Amino acid sequence: ADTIVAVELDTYPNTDIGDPSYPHIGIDIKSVRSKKTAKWNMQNGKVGTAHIIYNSVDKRLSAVVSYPNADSATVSYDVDLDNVLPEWVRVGLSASTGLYKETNTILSWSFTSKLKSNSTHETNALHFMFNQFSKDQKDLILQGDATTGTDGNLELTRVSSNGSPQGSSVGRALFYAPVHIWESSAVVASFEATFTFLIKSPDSHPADGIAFFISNIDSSIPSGSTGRLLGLFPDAN
Amino acid sequence: ADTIVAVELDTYPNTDIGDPSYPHIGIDIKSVRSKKTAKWNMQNGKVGTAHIIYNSVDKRLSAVVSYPNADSATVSYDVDLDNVLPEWVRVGLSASTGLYKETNTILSWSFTSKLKSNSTHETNALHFMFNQFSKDQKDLILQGDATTGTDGNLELTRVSSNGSPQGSSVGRALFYAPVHIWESSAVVASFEATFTFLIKSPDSHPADGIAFFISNIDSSIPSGSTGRLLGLFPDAN
Amino acid sequence: ADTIVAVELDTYPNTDIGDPSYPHIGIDIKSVRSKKTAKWNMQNGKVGTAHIIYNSVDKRLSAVVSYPNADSATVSYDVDLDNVLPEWVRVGLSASTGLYKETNTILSWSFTSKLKSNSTHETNALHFMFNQFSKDQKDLILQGDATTGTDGNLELTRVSSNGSPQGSSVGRALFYAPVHIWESSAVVASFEATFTFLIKSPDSHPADGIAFFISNIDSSIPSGSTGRLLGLFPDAN
Amino acid sequence: ADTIVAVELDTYPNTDIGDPSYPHIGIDIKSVRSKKTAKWNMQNGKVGTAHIIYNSVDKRLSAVVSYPNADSATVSYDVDLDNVLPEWVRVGLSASTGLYKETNTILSWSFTSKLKSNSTHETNALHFMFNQFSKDQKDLILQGDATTGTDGNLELTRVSSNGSPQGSSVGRALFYAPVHIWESSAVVASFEATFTFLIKSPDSHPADGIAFFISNIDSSIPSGSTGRLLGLFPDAN
Ligand SMILES: CO[C@H]1O[C@H](CO)[C@@H](O)[C@H](O)[C@H]1O
Ligand SMILES: CO[C@H]1O[C@H](CO)[C@@H](O)[C@H](O)[C@H]1O
Ligand SMILES: CO[C@H]1O[C@H](CO)[C@@H](O)[C@H](O)[C@H]1O
Ligand SMILES: CO[C@H]1O[C@H](CO)[C@@H](O)[C@H](O)[C@H]1O
Ligand SMILES: [Ca+2]
Ligand SMILES: [Ca+2]
Ligand SMILES: [Ca+2]
Ligand SMILES: [Ca+2]
Ligand SMILES: [Mn+2]
Ligand SMILES: [Mn+2]
Numbered sequence: 001a002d003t004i005v006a007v008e009l010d011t012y013p014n015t016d017i018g019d020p021s022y023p024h025i026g027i028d029i030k031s032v033r034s035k036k037t038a039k040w041n042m043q044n045g046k047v048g049t050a051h052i053i054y055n056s057v058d059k060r061l062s063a064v065v066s067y068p069n070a071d072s073a074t075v076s077y078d079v080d081l082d083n084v085l086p087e088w089v090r091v092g093l094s095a096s097t098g099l100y101k102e103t104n105t106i107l108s109w110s111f112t113s114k115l116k117s118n119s120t121h122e123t124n125a126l127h128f129m130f131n132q133f134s135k136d137q138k139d140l141i142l143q144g145d146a147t148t149g150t151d152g153n154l155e156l157t158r159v160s161s162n163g164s165p166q167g168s169s170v171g172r173a174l175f176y177a178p179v180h181i182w183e184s185s186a187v188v189a190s191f192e193a194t195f196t197f198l199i200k201s202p203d204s205h206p207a208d209g210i211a212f213f214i215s216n217i218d219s220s221i222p223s224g225s226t227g228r229l230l231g232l233f234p235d236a237n
Numbered sequence: 238a239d240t241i242v243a244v245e246l247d248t249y250p251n252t253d254i255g256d257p258s259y260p261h262i263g264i265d266i267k268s269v270r271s272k273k274t275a276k277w278n279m280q281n282g283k284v285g286t287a288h289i290i291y292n293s294v295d296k297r298l299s300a301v302v303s304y305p306n307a308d309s310a311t312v313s314y315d316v317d318l319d320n321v322l323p324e325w326v327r328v329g330l331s332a333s334t335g336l337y338k339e340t341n342t343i344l345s346w347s348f349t350s351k352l353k354s355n356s357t358h359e360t361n362a363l364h365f366m367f368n369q370f371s372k373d374q375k376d377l378i379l380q381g382d383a384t385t386g387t388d389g390n391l392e393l394t395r396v397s398s399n400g401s402p403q404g405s406s407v408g409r410a411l412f413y414a415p416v417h418i419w420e421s422s423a424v425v426a427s428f429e430a431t432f433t434f435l436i437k438s439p440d441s442h443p444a445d446g447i448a449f450f451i452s453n454i455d456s457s458i459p460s461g462s463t464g465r466l467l468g469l470f471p472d473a474n
Numbered sequence: 475a476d477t478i479v480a481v482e483l484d485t486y487p488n489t490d491i492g493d494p495s496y497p498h499i500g501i502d503i504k505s506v507r508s509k510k511t512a513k514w515n516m517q518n519g520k521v522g523t524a525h526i527i528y529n530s531v532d533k534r535l536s537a538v539v540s541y542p543n544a545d546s547a548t549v550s551y552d553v554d555l556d557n558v559l560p561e562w563v564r565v566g567l568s569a570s571t572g573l574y575k576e577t578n579t580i581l582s583w584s585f586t587s588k589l590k591s592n593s594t595h596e597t598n599a600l601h602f603m604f605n606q607f608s609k610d611q612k613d614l615i616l617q618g619d620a621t622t623g624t625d626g627n628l629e630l631t632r633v634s635s636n637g638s639p640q641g642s643s644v645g646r647a648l649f650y651a652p653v654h655i656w657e658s659s660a661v662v663a664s665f666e667a668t669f670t671f672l673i674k675s676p677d678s679h680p681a682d683g684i685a686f687f688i689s690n691i692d693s694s695i696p697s698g699s700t701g702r703l704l705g706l707f708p709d710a711n
Numbered sequence: 712a713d714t715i716v717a718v719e720l721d722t723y724p725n726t727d728i729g730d731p732s733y734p735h736i737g738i739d740i741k742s743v744r745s746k747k748t749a750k751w752n753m754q755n756g757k758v759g760t761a762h763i764i765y766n767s768v769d770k771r772l773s774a775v776v777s778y779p780n781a782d783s784a785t786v787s788y789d790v791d792l793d794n795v796l797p798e799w800v801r802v803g804l805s806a807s808t809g810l811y812k813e814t815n816t817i818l819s820w821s822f823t824s825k826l827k828s829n830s831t832h833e834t835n836a837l838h839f840m841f842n843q844f845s846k847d848q849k850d851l852i853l854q855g856d857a858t859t860g861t862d863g864n865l866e867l868t869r870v871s872s873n874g875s876p877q878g879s880s881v882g883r884a885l886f887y888a889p890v891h892i893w894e895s896s897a898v899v900a901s902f903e904a905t906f907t908f909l910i911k912s913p914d915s916h917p918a919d920g921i922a923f924f925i926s927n928i929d930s931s932i933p934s935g936s937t938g939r940l941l942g943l944f945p946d947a948n
């Protein structure tokens with residue numbers, strides 16, 4: 001099984017699996033049943049921004065999602081990631097559709113990770129920024145239905161030539177290099193991620209969502225994870 | 238005026254104004270009587286590192302002070318800086334000596350503040366890093382007894398040619414440009430500061446401390462702030 | 475007299491002062507008569523980008539100006555800036571109008587300067603990024619007619635409430651802190667600047683241009699520098 | 712295949728394959744016979760720094776190698792990397808020993824590449840910084856005899872437990888993620904690399920050198936590349 005820590009932007013309430021009865025953002029620690037959720041006023045067809053931050057001193061994972069001239073939704077959860085994740089991890093973006101569907105377009109993604117060790121002036125850092133995706137983006141491992149390059153964007157799920165999102169799709173984009181997210185002798189370890197997205201549905205209920213995730217480096221899409229499982233979990237427990 | 242938020246590295250216990258009876262690190266929100274403290278095992282004559290972090294989503298000001306392969310001291314306090322500080326501030330380093338003394342040497346100092354406002358990708362940022370200070374450090378406002386260029390370092394308090402710290406000294410170094418640390422339409426505002434210091438005392442009785450502070454842009458050393466007031470407060474209330 | 479090194483985006487050919495007979499970009503070392511110029515196809519009413527770069531190893535000052543889906547114009551000049559400029563300098567943007575006029579709007583500006591000294595891991599750095607300007611931008615010294623905050627933009631020259639650029643205007647925006655652009659013991663000193671602009675004229679010939687400049691820290695707009703002198707030079711020699 | 716661009720720090724003169732008869736630094740464009748060299752006063756047993764820079768506007772690859780307060784060696788060569796390299800590359804460090812030997816220790820390594828494309832503000836960037844290497848450095852591909860974690864450093868060639876370098880050794884360390892160093896619609900593409908090394912030889916006769924290189928992503932050490940071929944070339948043509 002993979003170890004997944006994710007920040008989900010869930011557009012479809014699967015009441016039967018623990019979702020709140022509204023679009024929401026949530027912190028998922030190894031289960032799709034979010035440990036904390038916040039009401040999110042998703043704006044169909046508009047470009048939004050999600051900011052995710054964590055540092056080993058506060059041990060608080062927080063995320064803010066906003067649309068220009070709208071209020072933000074923010075959710076935080078106290079978690080000591082050194083007890084949940086392996087030392088080396090891969091980071092990525094995941095999305096899915098099921099009966100209902102929506103485009104899960106990523107227009108930009110940036111990430112920064114820093115390990116500041118005990119003997120200062122011994123920081124290790126990794127930062128990558130994507131403001132354009134190209135047709136053959138060799139630094140991204142694309143899984144499932146994910147593709148790059150259409151209008152210089154990353155399409156996490158299948159969308160037809162005429163712009164229509166397809167149902168029962170699931171895809172993930174993971175950055176190629178392993179990330180050292182924590183290490184025993186660091187006095188401060190922190191990371192921040194930011195991505196802009198465009199979710200638009202034709203049908204009355206967009207589904208299923210987008211998630212920022214951190215996993216074991218060899219993670220792959222689980223069998224049966226389309227729909228409500230966001231291409232992250234094998235079951236809904 | 239002046240409004241001060243400071244992270245103090247207090248080496249002398251002034252139990253009459255609320256200090257614990259041991260060297261400590263504390264978060265000072267407009268008063269020398271720290272809102273939160275943590276015991277600090279100050280190592281006389283060794284170079285240590287202080288890391289200060291804050292972000293408006295968590296509204297938690299945290300500081301870590303370590304020495305190469307020694308345990309670190311950490312202190313955190315929940316505070317919404319938008320309700321304490323002006324929008325525009327100046328950041329700096331302060332130090333003082335009283336009847337007892339020590340060298341308050343700064344070997345490097347860096348700071349970073351970022352404001353990610355409402356609109357997709359509209360970020361404002363400021364970053365400066367000094368790993369060596371020159372005799373004519375034009376981008377620093379030196380107040381009191383602070384000098385630069387002695388061995389490529391910043392001396393916040395008076396030291397004599399022979400390397401001996403003087404009593405009743407106070408000095409502060411402020412970065413020249415005003416900093417926008419908060420703004421009403423920012424989705425996320427955050428800052429990080431790091432500095433390495435060397436506190437050395439001829440006898441085993443150092444006083445008074447070093448402090449990283451954020452103040453109104455027009456701040457100047459208050460009268461009588463040597464000693465226990467760290468060059469920061471006018472009184473001990 | 476001030477010492478000015480500038481990269482001009484000149485929209486009006488003042489043939490009588492040495493300009494080429496077309497819009498052009500040029501490297502100005504202490505004189506408005508550019509040491510090198512390149513033909514520039516200015517696109518009225520479109521947002522463009524200028525990138526300026528220099529490093530002490532190559533001692534080449536280069537600038538590229540482009541508009542999306544258009545060819546860029548680039549100009550380079552070999553100059554050892556340590557022999558032209560003071561060690562400490564202020565950097566800014568300047569613009570002017572004369573009989574003919576245009577808006578000289580800056581939508582974003584970012585700058586990075588680094589001094590890497592001999593004993594490595596002793597780099598000094600300064601970076602600031604502005605993607606939004608506010609009504610009271612305290613970290614910018616505005617000179618002449620320059621104002622900030624209209625649509626979160628920096629207007630270097632006067633433009634009426636109804637959006638009309640005015641003639642005989644000149645204004646400059648300089649970053650507040652002095653910049654150390656070179657120093658005797660650095661093994662590498664480099665800087666890069668980037669700004670996006672929107673120049674639109676109602677009249678048949680926009681004038682006069684925008685310039686990125688580096689000057690002595692106390693520089694002020696010279697008397698008679700509106701029009702063709704870009705608010706940078708006292709005469710046209 | 713393989714296509715190699717490298718900056719070599721050559722400590723042993725192989726006058727038969729074109730080396731000057733002194734230790735030198737050189738720019739190698741697909742051949743060990745450097746296109747340009749500069750004399751290097753290699754200081755046995757001291758830690759030195761190498762800085763490599765390149766930007767597509769000037770199309771000039773420059774390198775500076777210095778030692779604390781000693782004169783630096785500089786070498787520059789005009790080359791359009793878009794005509795030599797694939798779009799996607801891997802960057803790494805290489806070293807070898809032959810009949811004579813030395814330690815080829817890397818103490819820190821950082822790299823930064825940025826692509827500023829046509830559209831206002833659409834920049835892609837990659838930055839990694841290693842100031843300490845762990846035994847399990849998962850984001851580095853180690854080829855040959857290179858190992859990490861010995862004292863927090865990268866040993867590119869074989870050293871014995873007692874600190875003695877071995878002959879006929881070759882090893883390379885490549886950053887895990889492919890790097891986009893050039894792209895057809897980029898207005899500006901640039902990269903900077905810095906690394907600190909320590910070359911120590913038991914006798915006063917070190918060989919063979921260390922080299923920073925950029926290659927096709929699938930590059931592996933060529934057969935017989937120990938010694939003078941620096942683990943980079945198959946032959947000496
Ligand atoms: C009706 O159920 C189907 O569609 C929804 C919405 O798309 C998914 O959440 C769910 O997994 C799938 O089984
Ligand atoms: C005994 O007092 C004096 O010396 C101590 C230590 O320097 C200071 O804290 C104090 O303000 C000053 O009055
Ligand atoms: C016709 O001349 C006037 O207008 C032009 C264009 O605006 C300026 O360059 C010049 O300085 C001013 O004297
Ligand atoms: C005399 O030769 C041997 O040793 C030298 C120095 O190590 C290498 O350059 C060379 O390739 C190898 O053949
Ligand atoms: Ca759901
Ligand atoms: Ca005290
Ligand atoms: Ca002109
Ligand atoms: Ca050789
Ligand atoms: Mn959910
Ligand atoms: Mn105290």
Ligand SMILES: [Mn+2]
Nearest residue numbers: 484493500508
């Ligand atoms: Mn001109």
Ligand SMILES: [Mn+2]
Nearest residue numbers: 721730737745
């Ligand atoms: Mn050679």
